[PDB]
Each structure stands twice: as C-alpha cells, then as structure tokens.
Design a protein around this ligand. Structure first.
Ligand SMILES: [Zn+2]
Lengths: 19, 307, 98
C-alpha cells in the first residue's frame, strides 16, 4: 500500500490502533 | 550563585502528542533555543516550540532508543546516537531538508570537535575514531591495549582547543597520535571529561591537573553521576546512575567544586540539559516499571533561580 | 526566528509502516536475548498480550507496538549502565513547499 501516512492523516500509533 | 542555582520551579510538561504512553529518552536545545529537541524510545526525534508547546516536526532517524543529541553551533548539523540498531550513530543536515549525511555504523557515542567543528570524534568500545565532516573519511584511530582501562561507559572526547583527546582514561596527543599519560583507575564505569576552563580533567570523583597531573580535589558527591556544564563553565549539574536511575540531581560550583543544592524530583531521571542563558533546565522524567506494563516518560521544563 | 526542515515521519507509506513493525519486533527479540534474561522477555511478551490483546481487545499491531516500546526502554536502561555482554533507511523529505 503506497498511501503516505500524511495523506491518511495518521501517525504510526493511530494506524496500528485502527484495523 | 549558591542562591540562584539552588532554586528551581516547574513551568511546563511535554508529552508525545499522538501516543498513549510518552516515550522520551533524550533532550537538547536547538542552536537558537526556539525549540526543544526530544529523542524517543523507537528512534524518532520530535521538535517542540518552547514558547507555544506545539510539536512542529517529527523525523525518523534510527531503529532504537536515542541516547545522545548534539546540534552544531551554527544549527546546520546534528549528531545522534542510538542503542542497539546499526547504524548506532549518524550525522544529519538541518537546512531546507532533513537528510542523512554520514553513518558511523559501529560507534555508540559521537561528538563534534570543540574549537572549529570540522571533525567528529566517535567511540567504539575502547577505541576512538576521528572523522572529517566533509568526506566522512576516517582520519585516525586511537587505541593502545597496554594502556586501556576498559571503563564500561567509555566516551572519547576532545579538549577545548582540539589538541588533546581523552579516551578510556588515556590522554592522547592528536598531532603525533602518541599517548601522553594514563590516569589512575578508581572506578569501573566513568571515563572522564575536560573542564571548559582547559586546565582540569574530571574523572568520576577525582579532579586532576591537566599540566602537572596532580590530584587537586576529591568530590565524593559526584560518584557515578552523569555530568553536564552550563554555557559559561561556572556550574555543573549531575544526575546519579547506579532501574538504577536516581530521582535527584545535584548542582556544583564549577570553580571551587563546592556543592550548592540537591533537588528531588520524585521521578527517575534519564537525561537533562541547559540553555545558554541559564534560564531553563529540561529534564527527562520517567515513572512506572516493566512489571506494571507502564513506563510513561515525559519532559519537564524548569525556571532556574525562582522557587 | 529559527527555522527547521519539515518532518519526514509522515512520508513513510502505510505498507512500509506495517513491515517496519513486524521486522523490528523480531529483530529486537533476537538482540535482547544477548543482554537481558530470556525469561524477562518471555514474561513481558505474554503479559502484554494478555492485557492488550485478550483483555482490552486491541489489534495484534497495536499490541505488538506497546510491547516494542517497553523492550526499547529496557534496552535503553541496559546500555546506559554500560554493556560488556558476550535496513531500508529513512523515508524521503516531503516535496519542498508542500
Ligand atoms: Zn549487554
């Protein structure tokens, strides 16, 4: 998945928290 | 001086903005002190605006906990060291873009030369390496197996004029790459530091005369402490490393080595740093334990000279 | 005023973040068994899993991440005391002006 974290308005932690 | 440096007053707290558990491990002021720079346990670096408290940038530097940060005097360069992941140290640029310039894959500690900052001194176990900043090329390695003290926390370092190097308790003359003196060993850990005055060497509890190698002072309250000087070399801060981290720091008069104060913070102290104005002190402060699955670690900012 | 470059943390992709997490947890474990007591590692792993995965119902990714942060701190403490024990780089800067 080539979407940047900034594009998604996510930090690493938030990304892992959501799933 | 004994009045001013015995009074400290907390004014703010910085926490990692997006985390449920703050994980700061290291702090330093930026070259012009608009920002506090904070390393984290996962190898990122966060910059907070001191005035407004806002986080303004996050960088990805290493794959393990930041242990050391040093901005260059002009603010165009930054040195970092980490914990277990290679490369352990590196050199970053801080102009229009944040970028990596050089790797020091096996050096666990790293420092700029002191007079002109055109060089970096690195430490690998008992060995010191000196690098040229432009090329990255290794200029020399200082090591002598017959003279080593094998201190557990060895950190090589330049003297203020860049003509001398202290490494593993051995004075080296840089120009000739010859060992000049080997200091007596009285502890297992601390390898030692030059006084900014250019006249003394401070190794754990022993203060030696740089010219005559005489023992000048014995300062028992410095035992196992990690030492930091303020900008003018008039005051020393120390925090004890026996979790073995102490919960106090001590201030000392840097000209006669007399104690000033002991300040109990009721948190384990991981690191600390001072600005160039003696206005603020920043402290990395931890609470909790592995047993509780909680190691919340925050940065507290103090006003110096106010109670 | 002092100026600083824009952050690059947000320039990592979603895919590479997940791979970073998987790869790093495995590597920290292999490294830590040469410095820390093996049963300490096993104990923090199992307790972290019971609490955040089984009890709080968080994802395996979140669970692994809370665990990694604890081990990174343990390693930090070990190396600060002094240690005589027996791969893709940083993401790119964002494009300037954007
Ligand atoms: Zn070890």
């Amino acid at each position: 998945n080539p979407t940047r974290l900034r594009e998604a308005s996510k930090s690493r932690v938030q990304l892992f928290k959501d799933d | 001086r004994h009045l001013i440096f015995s009074r400290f007053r907390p004014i703010s707290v910085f926490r990692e903005a997006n985390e449920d558990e703050s994980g700061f491990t290291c702090c330093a002021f930026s070259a012009r002190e608009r920002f506090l720079m904070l390393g984290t346990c996962t190898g990122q670096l966060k910059l907070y605006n001191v005035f407004s408290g806002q986080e303004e940038a996050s960088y990805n530097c290493h794959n393990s906990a930041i242990t050391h940060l040093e901005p260059s005097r002009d603010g165009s360069l930054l040195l970092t060291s980490a914990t277990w992941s290679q490369p352990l140290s590196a050199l970053w640029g801080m102009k229009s873009v944040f970028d990596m310039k050089h790797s020091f894959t096996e050096d666990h500690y790293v420092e700029f030369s002191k007079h002109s900052q055109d060089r970096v001194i690195g430490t690998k176990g008992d060995i010191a390496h000196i690098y040229d900043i432009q090329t990255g090329n290794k200029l020399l390695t200082l090591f002598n197996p017959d003279l080593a003290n094998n201190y557990k926390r060895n950190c090589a370092t330049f003297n203020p004029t860049d003509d001398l190097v202290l490494n593993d308790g051995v004075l080296w003359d840089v120009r000739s790459a010859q060992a000049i003196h080997k200091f007596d060993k009285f502890n297992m850990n601390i390898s030692g530091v030059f006084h900014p005055n250019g006249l003394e060497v401070i190794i754990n509890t022993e203060i030696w005369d740089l010219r005559t190698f005489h023992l000048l002072h014995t300062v028992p309250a410095l035992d196992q402490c990690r030492v930091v000087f303020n900008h003018t070399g008039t005051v020393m801060y120390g925090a004890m490393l026996q979790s073995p981290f102490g919960s106090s720091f001590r201030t000392f008069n840097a000209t006669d080595y007399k104690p000033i104060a002991t300040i109990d913070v009721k948190r384990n102290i991981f690191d600390l740093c001072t600005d160039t104005k003696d206005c603020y002190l920043a402290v990395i402060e931890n609470q909790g334990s592995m047993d509780a699955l909680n190691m919340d670690t925050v940065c507290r900012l103090y006003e110096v000279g106010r109670q | 005023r002092e100026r600083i470059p824009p952050g690059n943390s947000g320039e990592e992709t979603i895919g590479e973040a997940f791979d970073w997490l998987d790869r790093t947890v495995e590597e920290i474990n292999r490294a830590a068994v040469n410095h820390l007591p093996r049963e300490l590692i096993f104990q923090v792993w199992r307790r972290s899993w019971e609490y955040w995965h089984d009890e709080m119902g968080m994802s395996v990714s979140y669970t692994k991440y809370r665990y990694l942060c604890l081990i990174q701190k343990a390693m930090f403490m070990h190396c600060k005391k002094g240690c005589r024990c027996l791969r893709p780089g940083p993401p790119p800067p964002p494009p300037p002006g954007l």
